[PDB]
Design a protein around this nucleic acid. Structure first.
Length: 17
RNA sequence: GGGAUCUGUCACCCCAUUGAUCGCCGAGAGGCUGAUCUGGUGGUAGGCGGGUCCC
């Protein structure tokens, strides 16, 4: 894929960025 | 060696469900991070590896 990440609504987002 | 913007990672919470899909529990609406993905120089919230720019 052109890009990727690791994010989960209702729980976490600073786990990636 | 230091700081931030960049990236990769890990326990917290917010915002968008007129952003997208699923799973589980629930007669039922409803609930759960339960799994995944996306987005906010939202957060002097914490740590660590790589790279960039400045000093």
């Amino acid at each position: 894929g052109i890009s990727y990440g690791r994010k989960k609504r209702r729980q976490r987002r600073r786990a990636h960025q």
